[PDB]
Amino acid sequence: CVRLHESCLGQQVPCCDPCATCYCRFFNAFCYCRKLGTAMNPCSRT
Secondary structure, three states, X not given: OEOOOOEOOOOOOOEXXXXXXXXXXXXXXXXXXXXXXXXXXXXXXX
């Protein structure tokens, strides 16, 4: 998988971090792992 917060180029490389998924900051360029900014119910982010 990908690192904690890096590019996954292709969107086929899911984040190696639990509850973490690659997201693109734009159309298709800034696609990197994301730990989900769920301040209400965050997963693995301590």
